Design an enzyme around this catalytic site. Sequence first.
Site, PDB file in Angstrom:
ATOM      1  CG  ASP A 194      -2.031   0.989   1.236  1.00  0.00           C
ATOM      2  OD1 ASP A 194      -1.726   2.183   1.024  1.00  0.00           O
ATOM      3  OD2 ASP A 194      -3.184   0.572   1.474  1.00  0.00           O
ATOM      4  CG  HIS A 210      15.784  12.399  -2.522  1.00  0.00           C
ATOM      5  ND1 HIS A 210      16.410  11.236  -2.097  1.00  0.00           N
ATOM      6  CD2 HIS A 210      14.727  12.140  -3.344  1.00  0.00           C
ATOM      7  CE1 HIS A 210      15.562  10.326  -2.583  1.00  0.00           C
ATOM      8  NE2 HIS A 210      14.491  10.766  -3.263  1.00  0.00           N
ATOM      9  N   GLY A 228      15.084  17.756  13.027  1.00  0.00           N
ATOM     10  CA  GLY A 228      14.029  18.490  13.556  1.00  0.00           C
ATOM     11  C   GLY A 228      13.218  18.974  12.368  1.00  0.00           C
ATOM     12  CB  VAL A 233       7.387  16.797   9.701  1.00  0.00           C
ATOM     13  CG1 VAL A 233       6.977  16.477  11.138  1.00  0.00           C
ATOM     14  CG2 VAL A 233       6.643  17.941   9.167  1.00  0.00           C
ATOM     15  N   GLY A 242       4.005   8.170  -7.104  1.00  0.00           N
ATOM     16  CA  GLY A 242       5.259   7.664  -6.574  1.00  0.00           C
ATOM     17  C   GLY A 242       5.239   6.160  -6.689  1.00  0.00           C
ATOM     18  CG  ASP A 260       8.053   7.056  -2.568  1.00  0.00           C
ATOM     19  OD1 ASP A 260       8.649   6.588  -1.574  1.00  0.00           O
ATOM     20  OD2 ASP A 260       8.615   7.523  -3.583  1.00  0.00           O
ATOM     21  CG  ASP A 271      14.279  15.523   7.090  1.00  0.00           C
ATOM     22  OD1 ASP A 271      14.653  15.920   5.973  1.00  0.00           O
ATOM     23  OD2 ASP A 271      13.926  16.360   7.957  1.00  0.00           O
ATOM     24  CD  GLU A 287      15.014  15.477  10.363  1.00  0.00           C
ATOM     25  OE1 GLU A 287      15.937  15.445   9.529  1.00  0.00           O
ATOM     26  OE2 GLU A 287      14.230  16.434  10.499  1.00  0.00           O
ATOM     27  CG  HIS A 309       2.239  13.650   6.530  1.00  0.00           C
ATOM     28  ND1 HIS A 309       3.295  13.614   5.628  1.00  0.00           N
ATOM     29  CD2 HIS A 309       1.401  14.702   6.294  1.00  0.00           C
ATOM     30  CE1 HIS A 309       3.028  14.710   4.911  1.00  0.00           C
ATOM     31  NE2 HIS A 309       1.942  15.426   5.232  1.00  0.00           N
ATOM     32  CD  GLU A 310       3.910   6.759   2.737  1.00  0.00           C
ATOM     33  OE1 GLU A 310       3.266   7.636   2.121  1.00  0.00           O
ATOM     34  OE2 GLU A 310       4.485   5.788   2.202  1.00  0.00           O
ATOM     35  CG  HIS A 335       0.237  12.598   2.636  1.00  0.00           C
ATOM     36  ND1 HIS A 335       1.143  13.351   1.898  1.00  0.00           N
ATOM     37  CD2 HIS A 335      -0.515  13.386   3.470  1.00  0.00           C
ATOM     38  CE1 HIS A 335       0.827  14.579   2.318  1.00  0.00           C
ATOM     39  NE2 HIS A 335      -0.136  14.709   3.242  1.00  0.00           N
ATOM     40  CG  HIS A 382      -2.797  17.988   2.619  1.00  0.00           C
ATOM     41  ND1 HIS A 382      -2.390  17.296   1.488  1.00  0.00           N
ATOM     42  CD2 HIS A 382      -1.734  18.523   3.296  1.00  0.00           C
ATOM     43  CE1 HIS A 382      -1.066  17.459   1.571  1.00  0.00           C
ATOM     44  NE2 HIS A 382      -0.578  18.155   2.607  1.00  0.00           N
TER      45      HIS A 382
END
Length: 166
Positions: free
Chosen positions: A59, A69, A79, A81, A91, A95, A99, A102, A119-120, A123, A129
């Site tokens: 998924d 990138h 620090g 997101v 993607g 996809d 970071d 991080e 969030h992914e 998303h 959103h």
Amino acid sequence: FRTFPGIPKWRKTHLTYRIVNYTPDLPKDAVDSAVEKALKVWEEVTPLTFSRLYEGEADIMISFAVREHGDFYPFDGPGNVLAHAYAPGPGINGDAHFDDDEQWTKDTTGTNLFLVAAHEIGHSLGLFHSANTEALMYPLYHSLTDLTRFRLSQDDINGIQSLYGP
Ligand SMILES: CC(C)C[C@H](CC(=O)NO)C(=O)N[C@@H](CC(C)C)C(=O)N[C@@H](Cc1ccccc1)C(N)=O
Ligand SMILES: [Ca+2]
Ligand SMILES: [Zn+2]
Ligand SMILES: [Zn+2]
């Protein structure tokens, strides 16, 4: 927007995910645990059941990078997101690249591979959103609701109540 009904591009209430790579700031296992938890309540809300890769494609499969990138929201470095992702279809379908730059954590914040994972994971499917408190659409890595009973967004309602279509 995206999402709903009977689910997007996978009409099964039995889906999967996979940390392609893992940025080795928190343990690979802890970055996996950051994602895997996201999944955990995403499955409470929709009837779906997420888990690590069963076979083939997934998924939402998640890699690691950021440090300039050239993608979506990359490279703001440690620090903030940082999943610099693409939606269900877009993607490598669902996809997200975390970071890698991080120093994965939870100093209440810093960054936690965990919430950008939501969030992914989110998303990808389509609750993507909004602007509400409890939501995964909420602004940042001071995740109020916390992934234990993460009662996601208001779009999570008008998204994840679609996912569970079957
Ligand atoms: C909950 C979070 C993981 C997702 C949200 C909401 C969203 O869907 N954005 O598109 C987010 O990306 N917020 C980013 C917007 C953008 C950078 C992608 C943000 O506000 N990041 C904070 C990071 C941060 C962390 C620590 C302290 C304070 C602020 C910032 N740069 O203001
Ligand atoms: Ca960042
Ligand atoms: Zn990337
Ligand atoms: Zn977003």
